Design an enzyme around this catalytic site. Sequence first.
Site, PDB file in Angstrom:
ATOM      1  CB  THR I   1      -0.940   0.037   1.218  1.00 46.71           C
ATOM      2  N   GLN I   2       0.873   1.963  -1.128  1.00 45.67           N
ATOM      3  CA  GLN I   2       1.641   3.201  -1.211  1.00 45.67           C
ATOM      4  C   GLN I   2       1.090   4.257  -0.261  1.00 45.67           C
TER       5      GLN I   2
END
Lengths: 202, 202, 212, 200, 196, 196, 220, 204, 212
Positions: I1-2
């Site tokens: 998850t950026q």
Amino acid sequence: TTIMAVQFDGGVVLGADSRTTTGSYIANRVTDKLTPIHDRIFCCRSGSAADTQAVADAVTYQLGFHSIELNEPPLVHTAASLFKEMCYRYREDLMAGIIIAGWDPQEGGQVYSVPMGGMMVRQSFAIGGSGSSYIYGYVDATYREGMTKEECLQFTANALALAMERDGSSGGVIRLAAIAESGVERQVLLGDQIPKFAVATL
Amino acid sequence: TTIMAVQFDGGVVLGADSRTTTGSYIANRVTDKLTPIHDRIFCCRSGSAADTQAVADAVTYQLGFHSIELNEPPLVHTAASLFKEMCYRYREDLMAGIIIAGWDPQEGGQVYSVPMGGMMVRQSFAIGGSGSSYIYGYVDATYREGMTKEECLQFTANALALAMERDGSSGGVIRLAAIAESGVERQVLLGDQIPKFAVATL
Amino acid sequence: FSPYVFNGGTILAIAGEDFAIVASDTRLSEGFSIHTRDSPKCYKLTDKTVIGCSGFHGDCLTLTKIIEARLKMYKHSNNKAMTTGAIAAMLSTILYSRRFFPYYVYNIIGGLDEEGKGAVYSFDPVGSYQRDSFKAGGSASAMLQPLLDNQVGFKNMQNVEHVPLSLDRAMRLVKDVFISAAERDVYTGDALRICIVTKEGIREETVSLRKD
Amino acid sequence: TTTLAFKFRHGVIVAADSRATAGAYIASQTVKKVIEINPYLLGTMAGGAADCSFWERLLARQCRIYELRNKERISVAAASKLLANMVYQYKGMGLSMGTMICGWDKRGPGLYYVDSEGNRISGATFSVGSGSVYAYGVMDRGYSYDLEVEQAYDLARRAIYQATYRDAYSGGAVNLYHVREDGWIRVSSDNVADLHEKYS
Amino acid sequence: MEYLIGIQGPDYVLVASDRVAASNIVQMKDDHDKMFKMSEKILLLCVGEAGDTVQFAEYIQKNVQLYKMRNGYELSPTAAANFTRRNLADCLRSRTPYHVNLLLAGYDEHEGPALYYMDYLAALAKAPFAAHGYGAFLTLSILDRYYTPTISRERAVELLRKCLEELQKRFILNLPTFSVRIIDKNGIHDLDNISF
Amino acid sequence: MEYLIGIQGPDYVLVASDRVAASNIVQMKDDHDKMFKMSEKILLLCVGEAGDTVQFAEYIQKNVQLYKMRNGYELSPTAAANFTRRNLADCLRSRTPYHVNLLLAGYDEHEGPALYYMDYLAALAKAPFAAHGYGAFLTLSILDRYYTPTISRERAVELLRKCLEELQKRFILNLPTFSVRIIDKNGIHDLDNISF
Amino acid sequence: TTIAGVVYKDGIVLGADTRATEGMVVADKNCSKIHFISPNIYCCGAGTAADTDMTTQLISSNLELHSLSTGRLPRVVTANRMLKQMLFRYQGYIGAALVLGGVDVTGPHLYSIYPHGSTDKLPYVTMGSGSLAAMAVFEDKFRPDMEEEEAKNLVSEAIAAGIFNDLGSGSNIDLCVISKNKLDFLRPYTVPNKKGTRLGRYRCEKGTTAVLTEKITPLE
Amino acid sequence: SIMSYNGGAVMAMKGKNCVAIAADRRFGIQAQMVTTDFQKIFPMGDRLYIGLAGLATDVQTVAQRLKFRLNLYELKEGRQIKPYTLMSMVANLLYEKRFGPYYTEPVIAGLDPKTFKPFICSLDLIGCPMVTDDFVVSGTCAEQMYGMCESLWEPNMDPDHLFETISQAMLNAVDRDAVSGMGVIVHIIEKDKITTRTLKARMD
Amino acid sequence: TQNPMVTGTSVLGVKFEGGVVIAADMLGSYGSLARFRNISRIMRVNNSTMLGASGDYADFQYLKQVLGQMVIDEELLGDGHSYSPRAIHSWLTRAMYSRRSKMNPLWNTMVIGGYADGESFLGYVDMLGVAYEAPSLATGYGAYLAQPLLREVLEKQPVLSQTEARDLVERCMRVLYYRDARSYNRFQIATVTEKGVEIEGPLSTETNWDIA
Ligand SMILES: CC(C)C[C@@H](C=O)NC(=O)[C@H](CC(C)C)NC(=O)[C@H](CC(C)C)NC(=O)OCc1ccccc1
Ligand SMILES: CC(C)C[C@@H](C=O)NC(=O)[C@H](CC(C)C)NC(=O)[C@H](CC(C)C)NC(=O)OCc1ccccc1
Ligand SMILES: CC(C)C[C@@H](C=O)NC(=O)[C@H](CC(C)C)NC(=O)[C@H](CC(C)C)NC(=O)OCc1ccccc1
Ligand SMILES: CC(C)C[C@@H](C=O)NC(=O)[C@H](CC(C)C)NC(=O)[C@H](CC(C)C)NC(=O)OCc1ccccc1
């Protein structure tokens, strides 16, 4: 931050939460966001604590000197105008949203909104702050014309309680203040006093 | 955008506005954001038009094939799971918030929320979209346990009407859908049929 | 998203005629907080080799596991435990294998060589290493190194006999340098772990430091 | 760092300092910057310590394989081309390396300069490192192809010493190598402090 | 980049500088003069950004000459060097910094020969010999190797030649000609240009 | 920047190049050869980014020699020029482009002398004369002024000397010596270097 | 840095550590962070050391001028107003986080002034990098109208928590008790941490150093 | 960093009725050495010294401006300045440029003109005083200097032992710094004599 | 998850005589918005291991799924071997480090508590693969607010009873509600002992004084 002001026949009711944050840390959880500019004139502060405090102090100094010179009580519109003049001129430097509510003999209870940018507008009721976005529908749906002081106090308490529940930058206790010809009556709702709405559980 | 779903004993009620924007321009003012995933399963789409349509079609294909293989109607939980798997896997590329509501024999009316990022959670009622931020207080205040189908329809219509009023990205007409064992009853509120709340007068 | 974070830590190794000492503080931190006070940075590899790792704890754990796995693989395929020199050479290749995503780790190996004499190897994050007589690495390396060079190397001192370093003198030196480091470097403190490598085996000792 | 090498009548002389710095901190003062590829070939290091050490060791591995396969020792020109081709694959990826390949092949003394930037040039005299400019001045003014062996040693030591004197990131000890027709020898290792007393 | 070099002997100061004025890969002038006559016994060698060098050097020159005309005696080399540093440092943090590298050479009757080094940050240092520009990297080691405190002026010119030959052999820029001057108790003497 | 030049006559091609290999500010080599012998009657002159020049030039040299060994006759200058252009253009948009500027000179038994100009973008052109490097901006006008199609090889060398002398007088970089070669029907002849 | 203050039954109790760090290395091991503003007002400083020193010193001088002119003890409100108005004018570029406390005619007062010029009047406040650690103790154990000894123990524990759980705080604990009829400025109130005893001897015998040139210049 | 442009290192120490202040001699631009005799310790009195490290131009500017103010103060007051007052003057001078500061970190060492009580101190680049009873360091090799001082310094040291300790601390500290070294100058200040010494140091 | 979307706040954990306690509020914040107020952030990994997670809730659910399936697979074999809390802690460290190396992190900070073979376990795992075992743990703002109280008590008294630990956890959660702006009144307490894992229903800190 959630600040709310309502107008009723013969006065106004102000309310706000009591949370001040620096990121996700609650520096002050009992902050008083209702600053008395004069007798029967109040301002609810939102945005930057430093800017609002500085602006409130300056207007308090200006209005007090103005009232002494004229030998008459100040007008709520005048107090709003002074807030508008400074907030508009320093709009690029100030991060401050204000609502000015109070009572004067000429026009009775009044509520003025001075959002960021320096515009001024008279409103039957006003809301502001980060948490105001979560109660726009509620106040629009549950507001009525001709409410009494007690109804306005309950209406403001319910709205603020909902906003504090949802908004993360709002919380603590609810500070209220009813302003009329008689005087200013302030109170604090804390603990079980705050209106409560059951959370759905599946 | 404003999508809402409520659960009552027997089924669910879905609702949405009918506005699609490309900035400040309303490309489609009668858009239908309630997509039938199956016979008794619906999804409310919010976010990117292309992403939601693509994911909805993909899940419809997957769920239909799954239902044919197992000679039984699909589960609303299964429909939500397929949405979650897609939304979580492609969370970097997708911008889509989904509400999955429907009825199945095993569990009855269910509402599942799948916001951006691929989370999945079951709720008594769900809201989402750009305008959902303006009715968090209203729904939390007016929601009561054990509502009827008629009350849920009125509850959803009132909530959407408020959000559409206060949100620039929401408007048009209200599209409602009630799903139960009997079937799906779709409704459209337009013009004077939309709930109305009077404005103030200063 | 930054894949790196500095968790502090100081390591030290001294080579003697018939011994090797590896010591490190037992504090793990992040930013301005302390994760724990009981995480030694010295890992025993074989009966005569110890490695001290400091830097990014995420890489420190992975690297120690990889070294432990590689040591076992060597033993299976060669029927003999790796020597200190072989471990240092292998570690250099392992570190350079990620030259474009390096292990944010400072390593110092210490142990006995094939002849039974203490040996110390110091490494960079990317693999370059040298056979030294004593080294310090980590947060307080700049503080520890100058005194070791003066007292162990007899640098800048004239008319001073170069008596061989004794185990007792080395132990006192290790304790003193770390006590001084604790008073000045924020990242080092809590407690000091000392591993002593001799022909008999690996002995361990712990002494308290300041808690900030 | 400062490394120099020049070809003269009796072979090629190779010298270097022994300092490695991490920023402004002197990590070591006993770094061996001359690698013994084989008894007839050696290479210098300048730039990234890890890059130079790894790729020179890889070159030494390749040279031994070449000797085993062809039953004949590799030539200096071939070794330099081998290293130049190996490092060209990673051009633009941040490798920092500068080396000199010195040896005595079947064609006489050989000296090549190989850089991570892709340079590969033969020459009579070379100097690589941060103190290269300082070493060039002393070497150029004192170099002659007809130098005696003892004179050549002094020129190399003096050139390195002056570079360490003027360059912050250079110092330690001067390691001196001589390459002859029958292999290289380690002639001496003189600390810069000792040299300063002698020259001053 | 331009080149300056100065060698100080027991009773003299030897200074030299290139004579090239370039403009984007073209030599616009081959006999440029980078030495300014502060007084009868002081020389200022100024290199750096275009315009800044002339403006600064001329400004200092006017003041130093004014001091002589007002007091009846010339400034000492040390006072002139410190006066220059004061002006350079003062302008350093202003809106109009001067990006100039300076060598001040002079002879005083009492103190004797003096050579001063100053960079664009206005850090003043007194050295037996100094050099400015990229060529300083190649020539400073030569000076260190061969310089002695008791070097005769004939030997100093020879040592200067060795520095300039190194520039021709190893430097990448084309610097064919160099102005040469010497200061001693008799004043400023212009020697023959060292050419190639 | 390295310098290349080529002049094509009625029955010959004269090519010259500088002999300097500079790392940052020091000429590491003073006798560098920038000419590659493609065949018995073709020369390739390559200047550009370090590594790219040698890798590209040596790769083309091997392929041209392989063609000769496979077919028993050498490539024509035109075929070699287009072959070089194809390889450069193909690698242009790839992940490993070559930043090299080329001059291909050769003699064909039937077509005769040929000089080809190719920049790092792989734009091929045939010209009576051409130059590469910053010196091209300074020598090209001289060639335009004094060049005629019927120029004898003796006058060609004189014209080449004129261009090189202009570089000495007006160019900023130090390019002392140059390598000179001539291609005619008898093959490639190495003339004496033009040094200064 | 951990600076704290509490309003107890009679007056104010201010606390602070004694560590100053430059970068990530301890610079001063005995920094004094409690600053005299008036005979009845004191200020604890957190943030840029130079800013806190200059700001408190300037206000203290201004108040002393104010006190001399009026002939009365200064008020905490006056100190707070002057501090915030100055800090606001500089738009937060003065990295001065302050804990202002004192006793005057109107009774004990405790403020917390932030660099941007915002103030909070609260029964107890904390600032610095160890502020959260100190506030945890205050939120857990604070009681209104505490005795002087109980208040001192609470503030000492609050500072100790910041000292032992924050890398920017350390060394000793300083206390300053202010009441209507007393002012106890306990500079080294407690010394939780001390340097260890040197185990070896590294005394440099005379003649160990090599000297090139020597010059003696007698005075008097 | 700007402070590492010219390098430098200054240290001060305390003994029994004596103070020692030491500094290195190198003056260079980045990696290039220019001279090996740069002055970094300036006398501000009979027994009062100021040692500045950092940017060479700022080192000279501050030392000259401080002397300008100190000379005026002494003439106006007709007395020798005390070490504490010199610190305050230096701190005030540095803080006048709190925005756009002088890139130097002074250290002060001296004896009180009346009581001959040892005094040492150090300041930040924006004038933050710091008094210590053991030692103060400032420069590019501060970490190295701290390690040597913390382990070698002892209380109540005779002038002979004080010189040995500071010299050893300075010599070994700069030996691990690339942009500092090339000789060390040590001043031992006693009640009746100022002995200045230059140490045999590495020149690499 | 950026970029995390819905996140959970601090998670506490303290080990006592014969078990471990973990607490976490039931609130998923959408960046300063209490969006989901009835979500459990604690998991029962198996009969002798529980897990509480901060950070992205979607990533936590994925780990919940992967970890739950793995426990099912192991139970199918019926061979008498079960994953110990330490083993689960080791696996989570490898999983989090591997995702970090791929530059696709699992935006979570996990606290692992278990009780096996008559020995309490309490472990910490971060987004970057940093892991360690401590007597008490607190992620997020709990590392600043709650951790000081837990460490202070434990230093005074190394061994706590279950009642003492529960009271200590309740006090810390009260502090977090007072000061942390992303906390919620409702929270869960999970306990692991010789009798297994138990999760207490939605509790509250109603003991919240508001003397203003
Ligand atoms: C005092 C209220 C009228 C205003 C208050 C209410 O939301 N504002 C705030 O809490 C805002 C929130 C946001 C700008 C990060 N915070 C602030 O204005 C500042 C942070 C500055 C860096 C801008 N918060 C802060 O440190 O407040 C200190 C404080 C504490 C108590 C009273 C007054 C001021
Ligand atoms: C659920 C659906 C009704 C989708 C709907 C939600 O209410 N989405 C929206 O209204 C969003 C709002 C935006 C601020 C993210 N808009 C959109 O998704 C728009 C709709 C197109 C018809 C132009 N899409 C969009 O911007 O990309 C398509 C596009 C491509 C090129 C040029 C212009 C527009
Ligand atoms: C063969 C080398 C030691 C030559 C030397 C000089 O250029 N290398 C260096 O000075 C290098 C590169 C520097 C020029 C930026 N400096 C360095 O600090 C590098 C590591 C950093 C790049 C992380 N090497 C280092 O610290 O030394 C490790 C070491 C220690 C002992 C022996 C061999 C190598
Ligand atoms: C000394 C107290 C005021 C508290 C103390 C905190 O630990 N303050 C500090 O440590 C602050 C910075 C802080 C953010 C860590 N800085 C300092 O104490 C140091 C001075 C020491 C050598 C005494 N200041 C310093 O290096 O200043 C750097 C600087 C330069 C320009 C502007 C602002 C700040």
